[PDB]
Design an enzyme around this catalytic site. Structure first.
Site, PDB file in Angstrom:
ATOM      1  N   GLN A  12     -33.969 -32.575 -14.535  1.00 57.71           N
ATOM      2  CA  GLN A  12     -34.607 -33.837 -15.270  1.00 57.71           C
ATOM      3  C   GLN A  12     -35.607 -33.790 -15.361  1.00 57.71           C
ATOM      4  O   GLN A  12     -36.822 -33.872 -16.622  1.00 57.71           O
ATOM      5  CB  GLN A  12     -33.065 -34.403 -15.778  1.00 57.71           C
ATOM      6  N   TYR A  62     -29.515 -35.433  -4.305  1.00 58.51           N
ATOM      7  CA  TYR A  62     -28.059 -35.358  -4.297  1.00 58.51           C
ATOM      8  C   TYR A  62     -27.417 -35.955  -5.463  1.00 58.51           C
ATOM      9  O   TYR A  62     -26.866 -37.291  -5.454  1.00 58.51           O
ATOM     10  CB  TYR A  62     -27.684 -35.564  -3.650  1.00 58.51           C
ATOM     11  N   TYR A 126     -22.510 -42.106  -4.232  1.00 64.57           N
ATOM     12  CA  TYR A 126     -24.659 -42.354  -4.673  1.00 64.57           C
ATOM     13  C   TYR A 126     -24.920 -43.026  -4.176  1.00 64.57           C
ATOM     14  O   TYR A 126     -25.749 -42.721  -3.883  1.00 64.57           O
ATOM     15  CB  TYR A 126     -23.573 -40.976  -5.822  1.00 64.57           C
ATOM     16  N   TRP A 151     -28.256 -44.016 -16.525  1.00 64.29           N
ATOM     17  CA  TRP A 151     -28.188 -42.913 -18.098  1.00 64.29           C
ATOM     18  C   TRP A 151     -28.791 -41.956 -18.627  1.00 64.29           C
ATOM     19  O   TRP A 151     -29.508 -42.289 -19.020  1.00 64.29           O
ATOM     20  CB  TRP A 151     -27.408 -44.100 -19.147  1.00 64.29           C
TER      21      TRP A 151
HETATM   22  N1  LIG Z   1     -28.028 -40.306 -14.487  1.00 62.99           N
HETATM   23  C1  LIG Z   1     -28.627 -40.006 -13.555  1.00 62.99           C
HETATM   24  O1  LIG Z   1     -28.653 -38.813 -13.997  1.00 62.99           O
HETATM   25  C2  LIG Z   1     -29.897 -40.869 -12.821  1.00 62.99           C
HETATM   26  C3  LIG Z   1     -28.913 -42.505 -12.823  1.00 62.99           C
HETATM   27  C4  LIG Z   1     -29.307 -43.162 -12.233  1.00 62.99           C
HETATM   28  C5  LIG Z   1     -30.671 -42.484 -11.235  1.00 62.99           C
HETATM   29  N2  LIG Z   1     -31.013 -41.544 -10.779  1.00 62.99           N
HETATM   30  C6  LIG Z   1     -32.214 -40.304  -9.965  1.00 62.99           C
HETATM   31  O2  LIG Z   1     -33.115 -40.367 -10.788  1.00 62.99           O
HETATM   32  C7  LIG Z   1     -33.787 -39.380  -9.968  1.00 62.99           C
HETATM   33  C8  LIG Z   1     -33.760 -37.651 -11.062  1.00 62.99           C
HETATM   34  O3  LIG Z   1     -33.439 -37.068 -10.927  1.00 62.99           O
HETATM   35  P1  LIG Z   1     -32.364 -36.042 -12.098  1.00 62.99           P
HETATM   36  O4  LIG Z   1     -32.115 -37.209 -12.770  1.00 62.99           O
HETATM   37  O5  LIG Z   1     -33.435 -35.346 -12.319  1.00 62.99           O
HETATM   38  O6  LIG Z   1     -31.553 -35.274 -11.446  1.00 62.99           O
HETATM   39  P2  LIG Z   1     -31.454 -33.860 -11.243  1.00 62.99           P
HETATM   40  O7  LIG Z   1     -31.916 -33.158 -12.146  1.00 62.99           O
HETATM   41  O8  LIG Z   1     -30.373 -33.501 -10.201  1.00 62.99           O
HETATM   42  O9  LIG Z   1     -32.766 -33.939 -10.325  1.00 62.99           O
HETATM   43  C9  LIG Z   1     -33.045 -33.673  -8.933  1.00 62.99           C
HETATM   44  C10 LIG Z   1     -33.433 -32.652  -7.854  1.00 62.99           C
HETATM   45  O10 LIG Z   1     -33.549 -32.691  -6.629  1.00 62.99           O
HETATM   46  C11 LIG Z   1     -33.346 -31.322  -5.954  1.00 62.99           C
HETATM   47  N3  LIG Z   1     -32.783 -31.625  -4.696  1.00 62.99           N
HETATM   48  C12 LIG Z   1     -31.706 -30.944  -4.066  1.00 62.99           C
HETATM   49  N4  LIG Z   1     -31.677 -31.110  -2.928  1.00 62.99           N
HETATM   50  C13 LIG Z   1     -33.315 -30.987  -2.204  1.00 62.99           C
HETATM   51  C14 LIG Z   1     -34.108 -31.100  -1.475  1.00 62.99           C
HETATM   52  N5  LIG Z   1     -33.019 -31.045  -0.173  1.00 62.99           N
HETATM   53  N6  LIG Z   1     -35.363 -31.060  -1.238  1.00 62.99           N
HETATM   54  C15 LIG Z   1     -36.026 -30.969  -2.030  1.00 62.99           C
HETATM   55  N7  LIG Z   1     -35.584 -31.432  -3.738  1.00 62.99           N
HETATM   56  C16 LIG Z   1     -33.802 -31.197  -3.572  1.00 62.99           C
HETATM   57  C17 LIG Z   1     -32.551 -30.745  -7.399  1.00 62.99           C
HETATM   58  O11 LIG Z   1     -32.706 -29.123  -7.313  1.00 62.99           O
HETATM   59  P3  LIG Z   1     -31.099 -28.226  -6.337  1.00 62.99           P
HETATM   60  O12 LIG Z   1     -30.376 -28.938  -7.931  1.00 62.99           O
HETATM   61  O13 LIG Z   1     -32.199 -26.724  -7.004  1.00 62.99           O
HETATM   62  O14 LIG Z   1     -30.873 -28.539  -5.562  1.00 62.99           O
HETATM   63  C18 LIG Z   1     -32.551 -30.945  -8.326  1.00 62.99           C
HETATM   64  O15 LIG Z   1     -33.165 -30.587  -8.576  1.00 62.99           O
HETATM   65  C19 LIG Z   1     -32.625 -38.794  -8.640  1.00 62.99           C
HETATM   66  O16 LIG Z   1     -32.815 -39.531  -7.413  1.00 62.99           O
HETATM   67  C20 LIG Z   1     -31.240 -39.342  -8.732  1.00 62.99           C
HETATM   68  O17 LIG Z   1     -31.085 -40.725  -8.242  1.00 62.99           O
HETATM   69  C21 LIG Z   1     -30.133 -40.373 -11.983  1.00 62.99           C
END
Ligand SMILES: NC(=O)c1ccc[n+]([C@@H]2O[C@H](COP(=O)([O-])OP(=O)(O)OC[C@H]3O[C@@H](n4cnc5c(N)ncnc54)[C@H](OP(=O)(O)O)[C@@H]3O)[C@@H](O)[C@H]2O)c1
Length: 281
Positions: A12, A62, A126, A151
């Site tokens: 995202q 993750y 998580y 969120w």
């Molecule tokens: N509501 C929310 O989404 C939320 C809330 C609080 C905090 N966050 C944090 O915000 C950050 C942004 O993440 P996001 O929202 O974009 O979620 P996301 O779409 O799941 O982004 C995480 C990305 O990391 C990749 N990944 C998985 N294993 C990996 C590895 N070994 N090496 C490199 N990349 C890897 C995933 O690819 P694959 O899916 O292809 O494995 C995915 O594209 C995250 O760190 C999350 O913890 C998110």
């Protein structure tokens, strides 16, 4: 002409952050899971050495909250060990590190929220995995920005906003949880803040989210309000939804660091959602 590396570019944030960083200022080097495996330190160092970046926006993670309970080692390997590897590399090159974190590092039981100084108390696997991630960053690097958000939703990938519009058109009524308060954060607003932090060296931990409290239920209604879709929303509890992971009943942050460092306040979630439809027309 600084260089910036983005881990987890297909997610995202990475997908949308990559497009919002001014290219006539930085050389954007995005990497997917296969081109830069966070869990492979030998690879992490190779890539960071070659490009040798000034900034590193670590988005890789993750983010499978529910399944995290069933796959704990995998949650840590990626979120904890992974952040530790990127931390080490960041240190050898002396790059500023931006580690995106979450509100699940707290119990989320206080309505007013928590500031950046309260001792975290991870509520689920998580949350615990990334808290461990945050610690390796503070412990092995000294030029970082721990940015906790919550969120989060953007233009790319599936999210709660796209789901309502998808299901909304077919349903006459739709039930959404209403006993979990939070603050929807639109990636575009987050990226604007990340961008502001990387131009400085005001290192530390920061809570970045849109202003105001909310709830999937109230949020759901207002999504249809702007979407101009006539659909009803039924408020349901968490027990009837059947969750495998324990979410907090109040996931809200106090925005001290931003306010204490001269930065302006984030827009309201209500206002953050507006620019979502405007940009994804
Ligand atoms: N509501 C929310 O989404 C939320 C809330 C609080 C905090 N966050 C944090 O915000 C950050 C942004 O993440 P996001 O929202 O974009 O979620 P996301 O779409 O799941 O982004 C995480 C990305 O990391 C990749 N990944 C998985 N294993 C990996 C590895 N070994 N090496 C490199 N990349 C890897 C995933 O690819 P694959 O899916 O292809 O494995 C995915 O594209 C995250 O760190 C999350 O913890 C998110």
């Amino acid at each position: 002409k600084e260089r910036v590396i983005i881990t987890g570019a297909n997610g995202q944030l990475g997908k949308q952050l990559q497009e919002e960083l001014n290219p006539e200022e930085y050389d954007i080097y995005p990497f997917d899971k296969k081109l830069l495996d966070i869990t492979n330190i030998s690879q992490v160092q190779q890539v960071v050495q070659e490009i040798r970046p000034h900034i590193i926006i670590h988005c890789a993670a993750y983010t499978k909250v529910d399944q995290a309970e069933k796959e704990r080692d995998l949650a840590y390997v990626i979120n904890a060990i992974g952040a530790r590897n990127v931390a080490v590399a960041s240190q050898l090159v002396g790059a500023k590190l931006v580690y995106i974190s979450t509100d699940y590092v707290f119990q989320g039981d206080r309505p007013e929220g928590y500031d950046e100084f309260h001792n975290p108390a991870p509520i689920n696997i998580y949350g615990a995995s990334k808290y461990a991630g945050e610690q390796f960053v503070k412990e092995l690097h000294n030029k970082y920005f721990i940015v906790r958000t919550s969120w989060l939703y953007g233009k790319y990938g599936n999210n709660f906003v796209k789901t309502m519009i998808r299901l909304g058109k077919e349903r006459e009524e739709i039930s959404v949880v209403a006993d979990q308060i939070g603050s929807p954060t639109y990636v575009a607003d987050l990226n604007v803040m990340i961008n502001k932090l990387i131009h400085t060296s005001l290192y530390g931990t920061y809570h970045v989210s849109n202003t105001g409290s909310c709830s999937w239920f109230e949020f759901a209604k207002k999504i249809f309000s702007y979407a101009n879709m006539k659909v009803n929303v039924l408020p349901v509890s968490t027990e009837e939804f059947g969750a495998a992971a324990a979410r907090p009943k109040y996931s809200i942050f106090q925005h001290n660091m931003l306010r204490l460092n001269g930065f302006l306040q984030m827009p309201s979630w209500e206002e953050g959602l507006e620019r979502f439809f405007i940009e994804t027309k």
